[PDB]
Amino acid sequence: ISKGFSTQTERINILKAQILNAKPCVESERAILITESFKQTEGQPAILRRALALKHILENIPITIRDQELIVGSLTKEPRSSQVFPEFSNKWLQDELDRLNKRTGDAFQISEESKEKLKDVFEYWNGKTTSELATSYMTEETREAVNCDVFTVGNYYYNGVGHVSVDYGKVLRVGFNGIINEAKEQLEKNRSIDPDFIKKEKFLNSVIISCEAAITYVNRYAKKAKEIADNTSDAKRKAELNEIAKICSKVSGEGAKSFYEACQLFWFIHAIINIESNGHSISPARFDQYMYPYYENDKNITDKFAQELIDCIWIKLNDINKVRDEISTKHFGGYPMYQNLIVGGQNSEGKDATNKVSYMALEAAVHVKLPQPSLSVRIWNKTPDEFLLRAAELTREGLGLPAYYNDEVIIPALVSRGLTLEDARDYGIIGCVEPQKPGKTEGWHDSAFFNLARIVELTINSGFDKNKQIGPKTQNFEEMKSFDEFMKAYKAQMEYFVKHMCCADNCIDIAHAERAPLPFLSSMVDNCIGKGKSLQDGGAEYNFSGPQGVGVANIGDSLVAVKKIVFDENKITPSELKKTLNNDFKNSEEIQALLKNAPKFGNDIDEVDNLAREGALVYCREVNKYTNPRGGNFQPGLYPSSINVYFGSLTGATPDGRKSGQPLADGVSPSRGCDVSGPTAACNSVSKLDHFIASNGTLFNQKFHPSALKGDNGLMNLSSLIRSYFDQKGFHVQFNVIDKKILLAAQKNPEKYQDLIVRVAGYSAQFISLDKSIQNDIIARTEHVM
Amino acid sequence: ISKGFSTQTERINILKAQILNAKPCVESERAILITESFKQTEGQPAILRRALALKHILENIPITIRDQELIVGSLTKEPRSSQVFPEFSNKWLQDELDRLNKRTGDAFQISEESKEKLKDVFEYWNGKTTSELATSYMTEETREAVNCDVFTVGNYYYNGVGHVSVDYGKVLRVGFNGIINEAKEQLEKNRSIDPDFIKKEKFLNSVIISCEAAITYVNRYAKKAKEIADNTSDAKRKAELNEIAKICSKVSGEGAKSFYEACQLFWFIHAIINIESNGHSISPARFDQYMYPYYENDKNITDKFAQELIDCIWIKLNDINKVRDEISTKHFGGYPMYQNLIVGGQNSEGKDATNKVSYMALEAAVHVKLPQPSLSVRIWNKTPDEFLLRAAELTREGLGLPAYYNDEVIIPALVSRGLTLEDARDYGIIGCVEPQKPGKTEGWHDSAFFNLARIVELTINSGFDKNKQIGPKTQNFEEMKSFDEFMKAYKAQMEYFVKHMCCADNCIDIAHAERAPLPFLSSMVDNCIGKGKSLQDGGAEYNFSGPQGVGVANIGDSLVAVKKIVFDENKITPSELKKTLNNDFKNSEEIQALLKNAPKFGNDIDEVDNLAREGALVYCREVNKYTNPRGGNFQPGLYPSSINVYFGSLTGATPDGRKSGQPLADGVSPSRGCDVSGPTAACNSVSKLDHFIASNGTLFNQKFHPSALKGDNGLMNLSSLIRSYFDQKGFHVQFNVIDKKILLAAQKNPEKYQDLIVRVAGYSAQFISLDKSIQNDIIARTEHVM
DSSP: OOOOOOOOOHHHHHHHHHHHHOOOBBOOHHHHHHHHHHHTOTTSOHHHHHHHHHHHHHHHSOOOOOTTOSSOOOSSSSTTBBOOOTTTOOHHHHHHTTTGGGOSSSOOBOOHHHHHHHHHHHHHTTTOSHHHHHHHHSOHHHHHHHTSSSEEOHHHHHSOOOOBOOOHHHHHHHHHHHHHHHHHHHHHHTOOSOTHHHHHHHHHHHHHHHHHHHHHHHHHHHHHHHHHHTTOOOHHHHHHHHHHHHHHHHHTTSOOOSHHHHHHHHHHHHHHHHHHOOOSOBOOBSHHHHHHHHHHHOSSOOHHHHHHHHHHHHHHHTTBOOOOOTTHHHHSOSSOOOOEEEEOOBOTTSOBOOOHHHHHHHHHHHHHOOSOSEEEEEEOTTOOHHHHHHHHHHHHTTSOOOEEEEHHHHHHHHHHTTOOHHHHHTOEEETTTEEEOTTSEEOOTTSEEEEHHHHHHHHHTTTEETTEEOSOOOOOGGGOOSHHHHHHHHHHHHHHHHHHHHHHHHHHHHHHHHHOOOHHHHTTSTTHHHHTOOGGGTOSSEEEEOEEEEOHHHHHHHHHHIIIIIIISOSSOHHHHHHHHHTTTTTOHHHHHHHHHSOOTTSSOHHHHHHHHHHHHHHHHHHTTOBOTTSOEEOOBBOOTTHHHHHHHTOOOOTTSOOTTOOOOOTTSOOTTTOOSOHHHHHHHHTTSOTTTOTTOBOOEEEEOGGGGOHHHHHHHHHHHHHHHHHTTOOEEEEEEOOHHHHHHHHHOGGGOTTOEEEOSSSEEEGGGSOHHHHHHHHTSOOBOO | OOOOOOOOOHHHHHHHHHHHTOOOBBOOHHHHHHHHHHHHOTTSOHHHHHHHHHHHHHHHSOOOOOTTOSSOOOSSSSTTBBOOOTTTOOHHHHHHTTTGGGOSSSOOBOOHHHHHHHHHHHHHTTTOSHHHHHHHHSOHHHHHHHTSSSEEOHHHHHSOOOOBOOOHHHHHHHHHHHHHHHHHHHHHHTOSSOTHHHHHHHHHHHHHHHHHHHHHHHHHHHHHHHHHHHTOOSHHHHHHHHHHHHHHHHHTTSOOOSHHHHHHHHHHHHHHHHHHOOOSOBOOBSHHHHHHHHHHHOSSOOHHHHHHHHHHHHHHHTTBOOOOOTTHHHHSOSSOOOOEEEEOOBOTTSOBOOOHHHHHHHHHHHHHOOSOSEEEEEEOTTOOHHHHHHHHHHHHTTSOOOEEEEHHHHHHHHHHTTOOHHHHHTOEEETTTEEEOTTSEEOOTTSEEEEHHHHHHHHHTTTEETTEEOSOOOOOGGGOOSHHHHHHHHHHHHHHHHHHHHHHHHHHHHHHHHHOOOHHHHTTSTTHHHHTOOGGGTOSSEEEEOEEEEOHHHHHHHHHHIIIIIIISOSSOHHHHHHHHHTTTTTOHHHHHHHHTSOOTTSSOHHHHHHHHHHHHHHHHHHTTOBOTTSOEEOOBBOOTTHHHHHHHTSOOOTTSOOTTOOOOOTTSOOTTTOOSOHHHHHHHHTTSOTTTOTTOBOOEEEEOGGGGOHHHHHHHHHHHHHHHHHTTOOEEEEEEOOHHHHHHHHHOGGGOTTOEEEOSSSEEEGGGSOHHHHHHHHTSOOBOO
């Protein structure tokens, strides 16, 4: 039966309204402080510059405690706002200063004072960023490949890496002190005349300086809290602030003992990561697993307060924001941070791991109803029925939550990639759908987005685009007499651009290692202290790079149409198809119709489903060939963020009948309107892809009419739909459940729908913060009933 | 019989006077140009910044052709002058700007315009030098050990590395074009998706850019030569200039064919090296081996013209100069560049290699009579008598040339260190006395000077000095009951300081790799192109580091005095000795007499000779423990340059009877006045040391009254002296042959003696250019007759 969800405290409503009422802006303090520090450290190795910079920022950055908070730590004075990270790139920001507040979606404010202060920042960091070094390392051929509108390596180019779940459990246990002491013991073991230990020493000292700065940072909140307490009339609130002060003083360097201590230290670990770097997808992962012991051992706290504290963490996760350039902003719409948090699943020995915190996590989603955190559940063969039903009940709330992940596939896929069975069983999710063993991995889980549709376009046009030969000169499509010749050309186009994408990624990898190795983040991931070298320098036990294919359904539908309509049935010649496509079907609607009526992916039709499989495997097999400077292997993924709209706008008409400039399909979802056989048939279709090889993750969106979720039956049916998809080896699935009228109404009167949350792809967003183009893509998705 | 020496052309006299009449100054163009370039390349990896900076310098540095020159290429406008290399250090220069022309010796002029232009240079390079990164890499304990007055790692700290003989032979054969093409071929071989090839690619491109700039530079001379010809009336000089133009246009890219072409290309290789970096000891090495074929195949050139050409090289070798800080100038007195050039010896087959060019080199020394190059001969078992007697005849000229080197010890010593027998047989000398396989080695052959006398001082004082505990707290000398106890403490002091010396060297080693990898120099040393790695990054086939011990005679004499006067004979107690030494023998001349009268090194007395051996071995065994960041081993050397005087001024009274502040002994030579049994007895003493383990070279000075070399007998006696020493496994020997009166007269009336050359240690200098303290040390040396 459905138990419903409990009601959150009034404090939660007040804290939540601080997020929604805020006006996202760009603040300049961090930028000024890191600039000031770098000017003083020119003579220092990069790792020490990084340590000292973080110390300087942590010591002098403005601190804020917002009204009624129980969990403190704010990265910006204004809520839901963003600091600047000029160590990675900053010229885009200098270019956009005056139009940030004019954007359709993801608008940012910026004070005239901030503009003026950034001038010196732009001046100092000229030539000194990771982005500029990265470009220098790339060949000219690669630079051209990168600007062809085939792929983008922007993510780690313009901003930090992130995409990591640190060893939170460990830091919660031993505190920032424990990390420091571990670093000191390693320094002692490394006493040696071997020159190899010189650089390792600077790294270990950097870890120590960084963690000491962390302690300092926590203590500043301890002090501010007391100071506010001394100026508070209300006895209840005054006592909260005094308890905040007490807690911060303890977890400033010690490990947590009580639950409240765990929650506050958790957030400080998470917050400080986001101060050192603005790499997003900083993902809490198995929060239920490492937080539950602190809950269960706390024999005073009430379930109500434990939940309130959790709700406060939820709200804080929505306080972080990150400004991006106007182009990249299209890739990541809706102010997203992609902080993935997962509950349930199995433990190291393959037994179920559902605990009370697992359920409180689900409860928090309904208590807070904000876009963050990106809440997820692990599903496996012995998932408790009530757990899956509780997740289904969350789905019915229409927040887009939770995303569902298949242990049965992910575990073997990970072991395949070199993880032990124990490490694989303990996986969490990074960002949207990217699996890793937390505390042990530098995964690079969103190193690039790659446009598969463009490859099909270039196969047909023999690598010729906009009057330039941008790809290999593969066989003229006009002369092709078999579909096999087409697949070969398609493979050859793919080989060329995947090659330059990955080498470009490698150039960026080197740049980060060379100019932004992270002493603080590295200290919390296994092997870094022991090897005495940063994440960037290959310290992680596990290393990967993960570029994404985008346009899967488009590729399958295109390939089957080319195969059937042209090569099998000879309805049109290759020349005719090529011309119609370049003309965007102008005055050849009859040919467009033939293409549209070819079998479409998402209807359990093997002829097309298999070509979607093979079309995607071609991408995947190419990605598998590459290794990164950290000694790790590339692994492909298939998820779009919000880039399928932008990508689609850069893509000509395709053989599936899609007009030029139209959005590509999201993830591995069937194209809009193509899945006309019910959601089970679509699930069967998507499950035919190789979800094992795409171990950087695949993303499957479905959207239901609210009636489909109504009643116990609704929950039973969604649960049954999920299980059948997972039994057939699907990787991931997630559901929008919303009334179409509400989205259209939100478009017309945004101010009336400020709290409307919708699922984009691997994350949910505040609907009205999204650009109209992304809003329309979501509205246009197929709506199913059961 | 004595053949005598031929007479140089009048042109040689003119060119020589340009050198002696010059007023050495500091010029600013290079500094301004490197600074300018670095400002444009902030976003580039270090190796490319190096290449682009070299390009910018070579394109815009002032070009000078001096009157009557046949071989052209001048690093400075003013002859015998120095550019500035702010990439290594520059604050010392900013500090000394106004007192460079006030120096006692090694004085430099500098215009007010130059001082003014250097301001922006000092400003830009703040924090950005190799020296500042080096200090950053050093631990605090090491920084203090470095500033204890025990050793100095200043050489590669304040300026460039150098200390290398590039593959001149290869570049003469294939030209800068051949080097470029080799690099272009590796680029081809290296094409791959493996990320390791990314950094190698930038190295190879940098080599290409560098060698292309080398071509540009030569072409600039070609043009300037023509322009000067066009305005020269004198038909003869006009034709010389036109021929110079022709030769430069030919060797700007191509390898040489004629002998004239080889001489000019030779000089451009050598010169450009000295533009990239100011590391000294850039040593031509086996000039007679790689230049002879060009001489022998040239069927048109006359011996006279070939000799004039060689004499022109000799003079050009004196045109290069290098300004150093106040302190470092004491380590390297006499405007020294230490460009070692060796002739004779054997080949790889173990057959004698004496050729016509070997003799023309010896003749050039007498034709030119300037301090450079540091001319040397190899001696072995089958050295032809004619050759050795001819070398003797040169020694009689009183220039301090040549330095003699013993194949019989050096060859096994090198093979011991990992060279093949073929490579070892082909060794040349670097700097003063440091052997290497030219074209295959990054030797770091003068990475430090180390004060052995201070170690004796610190053993007596239990690590305590100037009221600070600067070394380990070894056993109190007062309490010692056996000489064994003394030797143990002596070892412990040695261990501590050698450790920090070598580790300081490694920090500097890393700083050079990180901020100044050299694309141009690296391209001419084996394995660099093939490994696609700079010299700084371990590209050389052979890698070493070579720190020097100073004070060998003082150590043996001190040790025997402690052993005999204190522990054997109990003439005085340890305390009494310790107190009198700290008192500088004040009011205890009777105790000083005991010490002075103890057996002295240099008289074929085993008791003291063996302690000098062991005293030195303790240093050497310590050095052998260390490896550098290029995977090479440390090897010890025993030579002083001119630092034995300065070192002596920092050293207290020692147990050999030497008063506080007095100079230490030079190289492995006996202390002044202690060798009272003739030169043969002295060679016998010195030959008892381990010359095999000190494979970075040992240096032995003797000084003869000119009567000792009179007639055929004199020559025979010198030759017999040398043979007897080398038969007993001496490493090296060199001779001053000069009237004491002449030196004394040079002191009183310098302007009367501008062309007086004297041997210092491993090099000859213009006597009047040397500070008084070094002049006096040399005058005070023991003067022998046969």
